[PDB]
């Protein structure tokens, strides 16, 4: 992601996303993960829970697993040969992205004895074993930005 | 257990790039010996900015 700024275009010939757990088998939660390729239609707009989980597996490269074992969620390449552009988006997103990794939580947590855990926690990590192909040699800029000054005198004091 | 290759391999590269545009002094600005250098530009690979190297 620094070395991609030296080429306009890319395309993932292959990709995959490992899950490297951190817990024993005495903690349980089905979590479901996929890669959507329309990076504009998002799940955040859904407001129920039973529909959020059946649009996450109908995707053709989705996997389901308890979070104490491994898996591999692949990237499902298009049929056409579109090359996507590099750099930060600053635009519509369907030029500069080829997918989005979403990871969900279908069940509540459970402990050794079958009761629900009260507090959040971290459970693992995610690698990305990829292959990619770049096209056009160049050098994209680096976005320099700065916000001007702004004085704020809107509070009368008292002593 | 993850791990990656304990291999230190040399990779060699070729090419060219652009360095500076040199300006030349005249008679009003040419007074002392310090106004007689007109570019000093290091040669480390990381000194440039916008060169792909």
């Amino acid at each position: 992601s620094g070395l991609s700024q030296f080429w306009e275009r890319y395309r993932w010939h292959k990709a995959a996303v490992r899950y490297v757990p951190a817990v024993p088998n005495t903690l349980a939660c089905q979590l479901i993960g996929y890669i959507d390729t329309d990076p504009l239609d998002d799940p955040n707009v859904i407001l129920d829970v039973d529909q959020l989980l059946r649009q996450a597996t109908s995707q053709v490269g989705a996997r389901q697993w308890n979070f104490s074992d491994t898996t591999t969620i692949p990237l499902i390449v298009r049929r056409d040969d579109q090359l996507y552009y590099t750099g930060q988006d600053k635009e519509n997103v369907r030029f500069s992205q080829q997918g989005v990794f979403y990871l969900l939580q279908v069940t509540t947590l459970l402990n050794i004895s079958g009761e629900a855990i009260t507090n959040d926690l971290i459970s693992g990590s995610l690698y990305l074993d990829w292959v990619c192909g770049f096209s056009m040699p160049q050098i994209n800029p680096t976005p320099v930005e700065i916000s001007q000054l702004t004085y704020n005198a809107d509070t009368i004091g008292n002593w | 257990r993850s791990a990656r290759s304990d291999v230190n391999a040399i990779t060699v590269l070729n090419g060219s790039d652009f360095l500076t545009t040199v300006k030349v002094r005249g008679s009003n600005n040419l007074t002392d010996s310090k106004s007689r250098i007109l570019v000093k530009q290091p040669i480390s690979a990381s000194s440039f900015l916008g060169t792909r190297i």
Binding site: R18, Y127 | S2, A3, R4, S5, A9, T11
Partner: peptide
């Protein structure tokens, strides 16, 4: 084509952790 090898590979090797050996 025009492909440098072994840029940033990773290799993973699993194991297990039983509850007792009972040698």
């Amino acid at each position: 084509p025009q492909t440098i090898p072994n840029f940033n590979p990773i290799v993973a090797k699993p194991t297990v952790a039983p509850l007792q050996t009972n040698i």
